[PDB]
Each structure stands twice: as C-alpha cells, then as structure tokens.
Design a binder for this molecule. Structure first.
Ligand SMILES: OC[C@H]1O[C@@H](O)[C@H](O)[C@@H](O)[C@@H]1O
Ligand SMILES: OC[C@H]1O[C@@H](O)[C@H](O)[C@@H](O)[C@@H]1O
Lengths: 634, 634
C-alpha cells in the first residue's frame, strides 16, 4: 500500500509500487502519445485528400500502427478506442509483426495506401545473420476516414530484398516524388550529365502524374549501412503492384563517419533505419526546386560488439545532390552528402518520421500558411530502447512519447565572417554565397511547427526576467519561477569573442529545489549545449532505470557582423518542458531532447547559471507557464 | 442400406449407398495409392543416398505430400500411418496449401532437401487473374529416414515469379543437372555457338560438383504457356539460398500445337504444369550424354472458355536440343522441340512426376541393373479432375491412383522403310539414320519398370491361346478366360498393307459377360488404339459419374523390312488390368490408361474381335492372371 506523495522522499525501489501508480508523475500534456502503453517509431503520416485532415501514425505496444488525426497541428483525436490501432500483425504477409510504413495519399482505389514492412520472422538485427523473408513490403488501403487500414488480399509487393544481397535489414519504406530523379532517369548518360539540359526538364516537371519512389533502409553485411531505392515500375504513376529496383542509391562503409573525426554528424554506423527523403527550400518543401535532404537513424556500437545490442542510436540528417548512377553497373542514381548533422542530439531521440504537409491541408488553410511544409515527428524512447536497468514500467503504465512536430527547411545564416570557423571540414553547413569577407551559410532549419508553438503559448502565463550580465561564478534564482513543470523558457545569451578559448559554461538550472535540479548550459570548450541530469531526480540514485547521464549536442556560434561590428553570434534559446519531456531548441537549427524525471512537486525553480569563466549577458529572458492540452477528447 | 452383391444388378443410384461400401469393387492391388482417400499429383521422389531406398511421393487429400518407400520397385511401404504425410500446409510460407515439389538428394545439411511450391492464396487458374504471392518456392529437409520433411525456418528461396511478368501459374519445381546447360552458360556467346568446341567441354563435365537447375511450370497471360528456368546462383553447387533466373527457356504461343494440325502431340494449351527435364540415351538416363527430353501436362479448353475449368489435360512429352539464348535479351538458354507426343493418351492420365533411379540404388543393385534410369509415375485422376457428374466418392472411400512406374529412354525403330509415313510433319519421332531405303527412327521409349513387370508376372497363372487369323467379322471367346479382374494380356497383331486404307478395327473385348464388355482395338482409319467403354459398366447408365466416353491414342505402324520382305510393323500389345485400372501398352513407345469400372464379378471373359474389314493375324497371345500385392504391410 502506497499513495504517491510527491512532497515526501521517494521510496527506495519504485518498481515495488502498484501498477499505474506513477501514471501522471512525468507524463506530458502537449505531446503525442497513446492513451496508455508504449509508443515506438512514428510513421504512416498523411494528409487525407478528402477531408484535408493530417493523419499521424506510430507503432504501439509492439503490436501494429495506431493513429490519430489533427485539423490544426495542435490538438489531436485518437482514430478509435482500445489502442486506436490502424493495422496489426497476424495476416499472411505479417504473421509475426507490423513494422514502419508510409502512405501514398492517392493510391490503390484512389485512396490513401500504406506500403509497410510486414514481418514474418524474428529476431532481426544487423549484428546477427539475416533470416530470408524476415521483412517484406506490403500494401493496405485506408477505410472509414482512415480509422483502419485493410491489408490488400495478396502477397507483398516487394517480396524480397535485392537478389543475393546479404542485407542487415530491409525495412521502413518511405514514399516520395522528385523532379530531379524523374529527369535523371529519363535522359541519356550524356544529356543527363550536364546539369544544364537537366534543369530544363525539371522546370517542366509535373507532380500530379509523377511516379512514386520508395526508399528502404538497412545495409549489407560486411559492407555497410545503405538505403535501397525503388519506384513504380517504368515510372508508371499508376503502377502499384511492381516496383523496379534502382539500386543502393546511398551507402557508406561499415561504421564510417561524416568528417575526418565524426564530430558534427556522429557515425553512419552498422545499419540505417527510418530513412526519409526531403526536398527543401528556404520556405519549406518542394519536390521540384528543393534541395535533397535525408533524415535517418543509424545504429552504432563500441567494441567488442554485443550481438543484438545497438549501443548508439543517432538521429541524423544529410544534404547533398543526386546524380546519374556513375558508369559502373550499380545504382541508377546516387546521393552524395555535402553536409550532415543531427536532427536531435538526444540519446533517446530517434526514428524520425515526417511527411509533406500541403498548403492545401485543413491545417495550413486555417493558419494561413501559403506554402508546402515538411513536418517531422521524432521518437523519444521511454526506456533507452529497452536497455533500461529495470525502469518502473508497470508502475508508470505507459512508455515513450513523440517530440513536438518540427518544421524542416533550408536555414540561412547571413552576415557570417568567412573564417576558419566556417571553412572547417566534415561540417553541418555549406557556404551559400561569399565575398571572402562575409558569407551566407546554408544548413537544415529546425523549428517547432508554428501552430504547435502558438498553441504552447496561447493560454500561458507570461513572466519576464530583467536583462543580466554575469562574470563571477553564480546561480541566481529567477525573481519568480513557475509553480508547475509545464512551461516554455526563452532566452538569448551574448558571449564575448574572448569566451571561445575559455572554460566558460553559462545557462540555466531548471526543475529545481533543494534536493533536485537540471542544468542546461552552453560550453565553449567543445562548443556544445549540455543537459546535466546528475542531480535531476532524487529517485535516480536507487533506481538506475532512471538514466542520469549527461546529454549534449554540438552548436557552433559563428562570428558575425550585426552592425558594422563583429560579435559572437547570439545564442537564441527556447526550452520546452512538458513535465519530464525536455526539448532544447537553439538558433532555429539545433534540437536536444531528453527525459528530466524530477520527483518533488516543488522542483519548479529556475535559476541563471555561470561558472565564472568568461562573461555572459542574458537578454529577452521570459517564461510562459501552462502549455496546453494536446488531447481534448481524452 | 444395402449389402454389396456384385452378382446382382447394381442399384440405380450408387450414391444412396453407405460410406465405404464400394471400397474394394474396383480398387487395384498392384498400383501405388494411399491406404484410403484421394491421391493427386505424384512428386518429390528420390533415392536416399544413405539407404539406397527409392522414395515415392504424392499429394494426398489436397492436404500435403505423403510418401512411401521401396527397395525393389515392386512392393512399397508407407512412411507412416494416419495418411503417411511428409509435409502439410499451415506454415508461414504455405498457409493455404502445399503443391508439387522435387528433391535434391544431397542438399541442405547434406540431406535430402525438398524444394516445393508453398501456397498462400487461392484460387489459382490460368483463366482468371493471378493473385500476387499465390505460389512461392520453399525448402524443407528430410528427417527420420524421410518419414517427414521439416520446413526450413525462413521464407521461400524463390519468393516471387519473374519481375513484372503476369504469370498464369508458377509452380511444380523440378530439379536436375545438365552438362550441356553448364557448358553453354560458361562459354562465350560465339564459343557456345559451335557445337564442336562445346562438345569438348561436355566430355569433361562432372556431375559431382555440377550446379542444380530448377524448371518451374506455368505461363504468361495473353502470351502463352511456358517453363521458367533457374539454377543455383552463379552455378555454385553449394548455394541453396539464391537461385538465378535464366529466363523462360521454353515457351509456346497461347493454345498453339505441335504440328500443323495438333495430330500427334495434342496442344500446348493455355498453361504448362509438372514439367520434368530428362536426359535420355538408348539405355537410360545420363545428364552428360543424354538427349534433352521434357515431360509435361498442358491445360486446354474449347471455346468459349469457362473460367476456372480446364477441359483438357494432356500428358505430353517433347525432345529437342538446348542452345544459347538467341542473340536478343531473353532466356539465357533455350529448348527447341524436334518432336513431341503423349506420355499417356488417357483422358484421365496426367501430371507425371519422375526421377533418376541410379544404378547405385538398392533397387538397381538387387535387380542387377548397371545403368541409371529415369522412372516416371503418371497420375490417374479418379474423378475427371473433379469434374465428374457426381461420382460415388463417399461410397468408394478413395479416389485416384498412380499408374505403373515406367522406364523412359530413347527408343529406336530399326529397318523402317523411309517413306511418307516416316517423313510427315509435326510428328512423334525423328530419323536417326537413313540411306533412302531403310532408316532408324528415334522416339520416346515407354516401358513398364522391369521390376514391376517381373513382379506382375512372377506368381501369375499362364494361359496361352492358339494363333488365329480372323477375316470375316467375329467375336471369338478365348478357349479359357481368367476368373478375376487382375491379369496381364499380351498379343501381337499382324496386318496386311491393304489394311491401311480399310475401315479395319481389330483387337479384344475384355472384362466381358452378357451385360458388360470393354473393347480395345486398333483402327487404321485414324491409326489409333481405341478403348470403347460404351458397354463397360452395367452401372454407368444411371450413374453418369462413371465416365463411359471412348478413349484413344495415335499409334503408327510403319512399313518395315523384317526378312528382306516389307511388311506392316507388328502391333505388339501388353494390356495390364489391375481391377478398374486399365493400362494399354504398345511397341514400347505408347501408353493409354483409363478406368474400366465393370460391375459384375463374372465380367472376366476375354474375346478376339475383328470387324470383318480387312484381315488380322493374332500371334503369341497369352494371359497371366493374378498380378501381385504391391502393399504387403497393409
Ligand atoms: O528489432 C528489430 C530492429 O528494431 C530497430 O528499431 C532497432 O533499432 C534494431 O536494433 C532492431 O534490429
Ligand atoms: O488449384 C490449382 C491448379 O491445379 C492444377 O492441378 C489444375 O490442373 C489447374 O487447372 C489449377 O490451376
């Protein structure tokens, strides 16, 4: 017998508590997750052509894909009760399980069609032999407003991985259209080599009748991770049965990495997962004019390898160009990375599943958005990918959550001093334009979906803090801190050029009280935003299931000219705290999410933090408390 | 109710009788059939390398493959009780059914391995759209002396039919080795054009490390029937997982036929089934020196087509050569017929499944055979392929039977006058040599497996009849007729050349009494051996289920020189009557099998028959009564 008293010390072993007793303790209110149970990879999102509603999907309880719908990209509604499942295993093609899938809005019977990985054998992991027929790609059609997906009555449409290729994995199909690919696959190995003649065809490209491409993720044993590319046979937009294989359009050597030291974009690892193919512009998504971007998860491991265990799950992104399939007899087209980085630096952040959100959607119509966007949903595993040291799961009654929907586009950083900080190799940006004096950088833009950001602040209480400058080491409490763990903290930190070489650490302490605190700070030593959770939970000491290791992500603040005078680029911070789900956003190009499971009701204080190394100026600091309820119907 | 009294008239409607009351009425004793129930296509035969025993397989009750073993090819033993099943559906690869398969003696784990068509969807028929994933090819390994075949724990090894090819069917894998094919696929495009340099390579071939080939039967919608050829990837005899597609090595236009009139080899039809690839010599089988022979069933139909109904099931064979796949980009190798015919002319004869029977087998060692042979088992559907007009199946308690095992080799007809009878187009033979005076013909040789023939005669009572010459029309009873419906009738009929243009019909009446009789005679009008069953069963008139239509097969008796004198080749008849199962053999190159379901115990009289047109000399006429028990353990 035990009533949850979060004003008293936590019991020694949380796992000895009755089921569902910790259900509300760290559950978010503005995030996407099922009514209960666990949530795995998001997937199968789409805009219903009929209603204009945006459908969101995600694996649930390891027993299929569940769904929800939204008309504003702020509040959601479960497609049904009892789990809200759309499709589950037990069919002829998926007797064992239902893995990730993607949706063609107008496919079979001119309705939303799901191409998903139907599983017939387990286990499946890059570190152990692959069982033939493990993963196949099958079709299902949406029924009753999309509240359910009925499997087509036949075998998989892609019943096997590439011939005689020893794949490590062959799952997570993602569908997309591309003027570039279409053109490259219709010209001559000479008339398609000159980017000139090509562009002429691109300008005349029409999306409506363009064929669909499918990128499948995995790798090849003893060779390396890769993405297998397919497209409706013969480029026939009306062909949903046969998909011609275009080869491994994207591959890397086993455990190789972007850059000469794997500093900015982790490692390619031993296997690719959940690849999404995007075409971004400076305003949003355009399969005709956008640049090719790819988001993916990579599975890593230290040595020695522990078969069936992926010690590292990196949530990466890469940008580059696509060209003809060389002269050799391999892939018909190839993707070459020109820059890469992380979509989210969080250890537990992974398997992002996104989708183009049309300006014609009911969402964009309402918010007055005139362009097409690409919204990405990142997964935040609740138990370190099932490697947690006895997390109190039965006590919590739920596991995992998705992160806030994020808009992806091409971000530009103007007026950047063209120096070594810019010209480094194996980096997460490229020079869009320069004059040897100042340049304009190009990188992946990452922001909270505008409607979600607005809803988070809509009915919130606003409390600002006075501008401040810290030089000597200090921890200064806010003049007034929130009274709950649901708020958005925003702030700008200005650093002196002399801080680059200093051991400076400046930021904030959140979710704090006498016995608990979570520190978020910038560090120049390795140019990273850091989330120290060593003191985050008073319950973690005796409950190793609550991970407390430090989280961090790289963020370079370039030298820029703002008013004729050079200065270190301002660090623009936006930290969203929804209970235990903590998301750190910066300069519209950085994201780091993690779990901050504080125990006490009173751990809501916020404080300025500076280690006394160097100096820091805090500006436009403010806190919006309350957020909102993303699930009104529950 | 009614106690079966076969000395009294049959009841008007046989279906009103209790179950199993007709179980023994027309059941054979020397044929291969299950203890009870129905038998479908024979398949999966093989010689156990360990024991030397020959294993026989067949579909049973439409619920899998059952088996039996033999050490002498005379008597058999069920592999197990309760159906004696080896493998049945319900696996992940074959959730719906288990179709025909073939066995590689030394395969996975160096044990007998079954490659079979695993079925996931029904219906399947050339006349209706094909459901993707309907038929795949999976592996299973023999366990416990072969009394069972355990499916390998993974998906099919050939998970889909050729890419984007709208097949009518894709089943019945048959495995085989070939020096010729290996050579052709190892030389250049021009080096494999000159039979000279090609023969050198063949002479050095070695079966031990030769890769396995797999022929799958079916067709292509709107194109025609065909055989799909595959072989262990890269010619690697050690590779059982991946099979490279070599193309449609054998195809024919929809419902086309051998010859300008479909006279000698029926029609190619709308779909090919049960294709077996053989390499025959004048003494038996040799994958190194034998001429390519193929046996197959073809599904036919008159117009208008009745979807899901194959009105004609022809049991055909074809011989020819295999060359490099033309110049274009089609099948890598190609089979070109030089002659074709019927393996069995019976309406109900079909789906032959054979296998190489090594001289190293226990069967051959015992009987002292020094060469490898090819033994073929022909199916005799019990109910006109399930199109019977209400056959009393419940009353009989069993359905179908296989015909006697038959030896297939190259047969030679020597001293044949090289005239128009030999040079007709689209025929079942080819001239092996000639001097414009006499020639030697080459054709498919069909004889009863020697050990089975010997067993049929071993303990039988012999009764000869005096040589006789009938000139007027007459029906003359034998001086002494058998007293049972288990006997072997042999005879030789000599005709004068003048008989070729005559309306002559000469032969015998068997299974006769006052109220019943079955006529078997040769007819020069259309050069055919005929089995008239219009009076076969006193029960047929009120039981349409008992088919009574005339059965016939083409047999040309050439002009030959036997003693410096020309004569019409002797018609050498061997008629095996194994109860209702009747098999008519002639000149070692013809077979016609059917069901002769006489009712009365006394219908065992045999008579000479001549229609008075022309003349006929009967010689060496004899009857061996009794046959033998093929299943001593039952
Ligand atoms: O269980 C199948 C696969 O699921 C993926 O989500 C994991 O990241 C892999 O390590 C695993 O092999
Ligand atoms: O059920 C499937 C197939 O079985 C074969 O034996 C029949 O002869 C075909 O007509 C049929 O398509």
């Amino acid at each position: 017998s035990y009533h949850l008293d979060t004003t008293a010390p936590p019991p020694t072993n949380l796992s000895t508590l009755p089921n569902n007793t910790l259900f509300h303790l760290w559950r978010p209110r503005a995030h996407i997750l099922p009514a209960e149970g666990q949530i795995g990879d998001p997937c199968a999102h789409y805009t219903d052509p009929s209603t204009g509603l945006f459908h969101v999907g995600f694996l649930h309880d390891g027993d299929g894909i569940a769904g929800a719908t939204t008309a504003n990209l702020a509040t959601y509604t479960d497609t049904s009760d009892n789990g809200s499942f759309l499709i589950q295993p037990g069919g002829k093609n998926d007797p064992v399980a239902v893995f990730d899938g993607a949706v063609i809005p107008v496919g079979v019977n001119n309705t939303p069609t799901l191409l998903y990985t139907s599983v017939s054998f387990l286990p499946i992991h890059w570190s152990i032999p692959y069982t033939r027929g493990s993963e196949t790609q099958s079709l299902a059609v949406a029924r009753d407003g999309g509240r359910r997906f009925d499997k087509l009555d036949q075998g998989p449409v892609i019943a096997d991985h590439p011939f005689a290729v020893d794949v490590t994995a062959f799952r997570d199909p993602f569908v997309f259209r591309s003027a570039r690919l279409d053109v490259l696959l219709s010209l001559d190995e000479e008339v398609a080599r000159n980017e000139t003649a090509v562009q002429q065809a691109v300008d005349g490209w029409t999306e409506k009748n363009a064929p669909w491409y499918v990128a499948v993720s995995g790798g090849v044993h003893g060779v390396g991770p890769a993405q297998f590319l397919y497209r409706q046979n013969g480029g026939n937009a009306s062909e949903f049965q046969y998909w011609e294989y275009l080869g491994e359009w994207w591959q890397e050597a086993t455990n190789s990495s972007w850059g000469d030291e794997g500093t900015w974009a982790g490692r390619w690892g031993f296997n690719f997962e959940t690849g999404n193919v995007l075409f971004l512009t400076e305003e949003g998504h355009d399969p005709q004019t956008g640049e090719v971007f790819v988001t993916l998860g990579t599975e890593g491991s230290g040595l020695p390898i522990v078969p069936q265990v992926s010690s590292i799950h990196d949530m990466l992104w890469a940008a580059g160009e696509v060209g003809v399939g060389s002269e050799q007899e391999g892939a018909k087209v190839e993707f070459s990375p020109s820059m890469a980085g992380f979509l989210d630096w969080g250890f537990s952040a992974y398997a992002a599943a996104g989708k183009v959100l049309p300006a014609s959607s009911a969402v964009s119509k309402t918010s007055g958005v005139e362009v097409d966007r690409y919204v990405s949903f990142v997964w935040l595993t609740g138990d370190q990918y099932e490697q947690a040291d006895g997390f109190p799961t039965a006590q919590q009654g739920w596991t995992g959550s998705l992160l806030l929907p994020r808009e992806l586009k091409v971000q530009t950083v103007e007026n950047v001093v063209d120096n070594e900080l810019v010209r480094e190799e194996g980096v997460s940006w490229v020079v869009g334009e320069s004059d040897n004096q100042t340049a304009t950088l190009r990188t992946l833009g990452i922001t909270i979906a505008r409607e979600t950001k607005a809803a988070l602040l809509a009915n919130g209480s606003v409390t600002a803090e006075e501008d401040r400058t810290l030089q000597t080491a200090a921890v200064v409490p806010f003049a007034q801190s929130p009274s709950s763990k649901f708020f958005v903290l925003t702030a700008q930190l200005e650093f002196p050029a002399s801080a680059r070489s200093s051991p400076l650490q400046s930021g904030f302490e959140i979710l704090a009280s006498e016995l608990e605190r979570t520190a978020i700070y910038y560090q120049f030593s390795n140019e990273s935003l850091v989330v120290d959770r060593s003191q985050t939970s008073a319950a973690a000491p005796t409950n190793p299931g609550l991970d407390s290791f430090t989280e961090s992500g790289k963020l370079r603040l370039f030298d820029v000219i703002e008013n004729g005078q050079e200065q270190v680029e301002t660090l623009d911070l936006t930290v969203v705290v929804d209970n235990a789900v903590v998301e750190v956003y910066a300069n519209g190009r950085f994201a780091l999410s993690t779990w901050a499971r504080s125990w006490y009701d009173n751990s809501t204080q916020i404080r300025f933090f500076h280690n006394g190394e160097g100096e820091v100026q805090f500006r436009n600091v403010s806190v919006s408390e309350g957020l909102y309820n993303a699930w009104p119907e529950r």
